[PDB]
Write a protein that binds this ligand. Structure first.
Ligand SMILES: [Mg+2]
Ligand SMILES: [Mg+2]
Ligand SMILES: [Mg+2]
Ligand SMILES: [Mg+2]
Ligand SMILES: [Mg+2]
Ligand SMILES: [Mg+2]
Ligand SMILES: [Mg+2]
Ligand SMILES: [Mg+2]
Ligand SMILES: [Mg+2]
Lengths: 247, 52, 230
RNA sequence: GAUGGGGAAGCUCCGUUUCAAAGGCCUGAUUUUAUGCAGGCCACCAUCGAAAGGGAAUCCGGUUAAGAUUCCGGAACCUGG
RNA sequence: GCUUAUCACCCCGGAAUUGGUUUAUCCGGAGAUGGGGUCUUAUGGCUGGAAGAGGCCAGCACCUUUGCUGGCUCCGGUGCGCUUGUGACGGCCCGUGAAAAUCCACAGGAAGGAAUAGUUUUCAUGCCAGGUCGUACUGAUAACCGCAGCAGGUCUCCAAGG
RNA sequence: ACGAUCAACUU
RNA sequence: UUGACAUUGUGAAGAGACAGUUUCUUUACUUAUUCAAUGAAGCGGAGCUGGAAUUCAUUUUCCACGUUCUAGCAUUCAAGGUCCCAUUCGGGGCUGAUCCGGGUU
């Protein structure tokens, strides 16, 4: 009989993201004439930590083609990129780690990151630390490229969509156990208000579908259908299966 | 810094009170060497464009 | 001069900030400019039923110029001439009084939509000029059919502003000659012949032809490329 | 949190730079007097939000029933002109 | 006002027999140790401000506005001391720990400028002004909240000897 | 190869 | 969430059943609608300039279009080249920087 926690998150009052210390949105350059027809050279000034982000960020300076000034861009740093390195972004850019190329300008098997879903969206795929997209094929007839995503999914993207050669830096981060509540605390105080988590079965029925009972138990199937409504979707939503894989 | 004279705020050199005199030396050497290399590069290009 | 040298810049990609070029093609115009351009584009993209697009078949430059040369000989009297005409009429009423008509009969261009449509219906109009740019077009869209029904020669001519300046208005949207002088009857007959050769005689064929359906520059090029191979 | 704009029967709601024609710098200046045409200058969008965050510049001695880094005496400093 | 520094940097020189060096093991042919220099002025010293003030005393006069006169006010030491500021470091993070106003410098070269007053002056001195509102007192076993002059509650600075 | 001076508080 | 009608137009194919009608494929078009971006900067077509023509100079042709050791620098309607003017410490046009369509992409 009460609005439950996952319903309350959408009003976004105390559940917004903590963005005070963040360096700015990490995205590729706006796709312009220079990247569309040739290449443009930028310089890596800094590799900086970003609050709430596992991967480090590269800060790259490009010359403005139309006005006398410099433009800062916040890239997600790939493994091996160093300060003082020259970055080449465009159709005619070379196949080197850190360079930004259209997906149609790389051979099959190329490892890229920060891949655009559509050309000009400035990077949407394979952004977290240690993640990458594999180029697996080309269809020049329909100007399309097949890729494998970090989740194992196969995708078809415009060959004009851009990517950064290499793999996102910071990999292996989740291989270290946190060991204690305080490290999770500090991890999430830079992200959002999602920790700690109270179990639904530890609540009363007013608070959660899992609440109540003279023992802690869910009492009805925890696999919830797609067509369930808000306040009902607590548990395993639209689960094709459950239980430990391979016995 | 708006109160004191220019002497307190700069050094008698190019990029006086903005760069550290080793970075200025590095800038000078890099500029001269890359400009000479650009001359060499275009002479090589003009030579190799005469092969045909 | 030994003190001057050839710099030339390299405006290729990655070098030498681009010079100022004409960007008139990429200007983000105000909304009213955008809408008044796109409305014309949409009008010609859609298939135009023959009742419209009977317009945009306007009288050509030479015949229109001579037509207006004739119509300019029958300009309605303005306020300045009407005031002194009324003074002459006042004097004639004072002393002369033939019956009441010491002033001569006027020969003037007839204008005004309701007045002209009534003249067409009574078959008094000997030549009707219809402006080609009346918005809303419903005001004159029936006029060519009405003139054809009544057997009155009509021309679709460019400029409601031009008709207006003919009849001392900002805009007229229609003009008509119902009577001309003897020395201008033969010129009127020549105009009627030329006008009928373009509007009344082709009316039945125009009434069955749909306008519009025209593509833009890029789509036209792409369709030409497709048609070259397929 | 206005404006542009959109929603709402409406009280009003969204949104904070947005799908807007959104402005002020120097220089020519006959200084009865304020301007006349010049040629670009970013495109930053109002405003409110801290007496513990940032921040131009003052100290000592004396003095009252009750005021003082504020008054008196002396000695400084900053900003604008 | 003069002077005064850890760090940093410069010149000479070319280092294995490796050296220098911190409480903490880092540094050196990408030039160490060494010799000689440059710089930030935290901070301290001397001088001006300034002894004329303030402090402590001694002689007379005394409510005659209430005083007057004179002297001294100096030189050292010590530290795992306390409080506090600061520096160079070191540890820690799947945590790497605001923004803007504002000020300055540099790059650039648009203009402007030369002989009994021809430009400009971030150098010295000189002239004028700096509005508005707050400012008393308590801040608590009696000045606040708790029905009160209530053993409750209510943020913070300084902190002597054994 | 020591001598002379100054100074703490730990064991 | 699913269907229907409206928004909602234009070509074809062609399953056809059969002057025509009627459901039914499949794909096509762009201007309605929808998504996104930019300070709406380089879009589309053609041309010039290069190389393979087994070209007929006749593009039944495709690809390229000034930047790739280096943590420098890149701005004053651009120097230059050409014309015009009563030119002084100059002013202007064209070219440099191909042409055309005003569809920002
Ligand atoms: Mg739990
Ligand atoms: Mg319980
Ligand atoms: Mg249930
Ligand atoms: Mg304020
Ligand atoms: Mg007091
Ligand atoms: Mg005073
Ligand atoms: Mg006070
Ligand atoms: Mg007080
Ligand atoms: Mg007080």
């Amino acid at each position: 009989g009460r609005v439950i926690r996952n319903q309350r998150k959408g009003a976004g009052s105390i559940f917004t993201s903590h963005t005070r210390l963040r360096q700015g949105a990490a995205k590729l350059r706006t796709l312009d004439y220079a990247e569309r027809h040739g290449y443009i050279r930028g310089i890596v000034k800094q590799i900086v930590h970003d609050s709430g982000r596992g991967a480090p960020l590269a800060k790259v300076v490009f010359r403005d083609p139309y006005k006398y000034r410099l433009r800062e861009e916040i890239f997600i740093a790939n493994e091996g990129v160093h300060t003082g390195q020259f970055i080449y972004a465009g159709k005619k850019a070379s196949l080197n780690v850190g360079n930004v190329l259209p997906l149609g300008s790389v051979p099959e098997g190329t490892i890229v990151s920060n891949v655009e879903e559509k050309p000009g969206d400035r990077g949407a795929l394979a952004r977290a630390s240690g993640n990458y997209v594999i180029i697996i094929g080309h269809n020049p007839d329909e100007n399309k490229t097949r890729v494998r995503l970090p989740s194992g999914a196969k995708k078809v993207i415009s060959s004009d969509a851009r990517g950064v050669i290499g793999v996102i830096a910071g990999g292996g981060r989740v291989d270290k156990p946190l060991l204690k509540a305080g490290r999770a605390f500090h991890k999430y105080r830079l992200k959002r208000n999602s920790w700690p988590k109270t179990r639904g079965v530890a609540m009363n029925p007013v608070d959660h579908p899992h609440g109540g009972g003279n023992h802690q138990h869910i009492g009805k199937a925890s696999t919830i259908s797609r067509g369930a409504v808000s306040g009902q979707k607590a548990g395993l939503i639209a689960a094709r299966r459950t239980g430990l894989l391979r016995g | 810094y708006a109160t004191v004279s220019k002497t307190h705020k700069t050094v008698s050199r190019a990029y006086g009170g903005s760069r550290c005199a080793n970075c200025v030396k590095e800038r000078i050497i890099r500029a001269f060497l890359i400009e000479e290399q650009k001359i060499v590069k275009k002479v090589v290009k003009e030579q190799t464009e005469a092969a045909k | 001069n030994p003190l001057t040298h050839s710099t030339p810049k390299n405006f290729g990609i990655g070098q030498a900030v681009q010079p100022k070029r004409n960007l008139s093609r990429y200007v983000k115009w105000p909304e009213y400019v955008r809408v008044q351009r796109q409305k014309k584009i949409l009008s010609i993209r859609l298939k135009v039923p023959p009742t419209i697009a009977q317009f945009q078949y306007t009288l050509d430059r030479n015949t229109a110029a001579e037509t207006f040369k004739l119509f300019n000989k029958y300009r309605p009297e303005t306020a300045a001439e009407k005031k002194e005409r009324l003074t002459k009429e006042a004097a004639a009423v004072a002393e002369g009084k033939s019956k009441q008509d010491a002033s001569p009969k006027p020969y003037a261009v007839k204008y005004g939509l309701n007045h002209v449509v009534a003249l067409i219906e009574n078959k008094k109009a000997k030549l009707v000029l219809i402006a080609n740019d009346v918005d809303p077009i419903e005001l004159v869209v029936f006029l060519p059919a009405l003139c054809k029904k009544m057997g009155v020669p009509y021309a679709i001519v460019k400029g409601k502003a031009r008709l207006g300046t003919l009849v001392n208005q900002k805009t007229s949207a229609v003009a008509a000659l119902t009577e001309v002088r003897a020395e201008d009857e033969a010129a009127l007959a020549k105009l009627v012949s030329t006008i009928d050769a373009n509007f009344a005689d082709k009316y039945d064929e125009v009434k069955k032809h749909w306008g519009g359906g025209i593509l833009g520059n890029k789509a036209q090029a792409k369709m030409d490329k497709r048609a070259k191979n397929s």
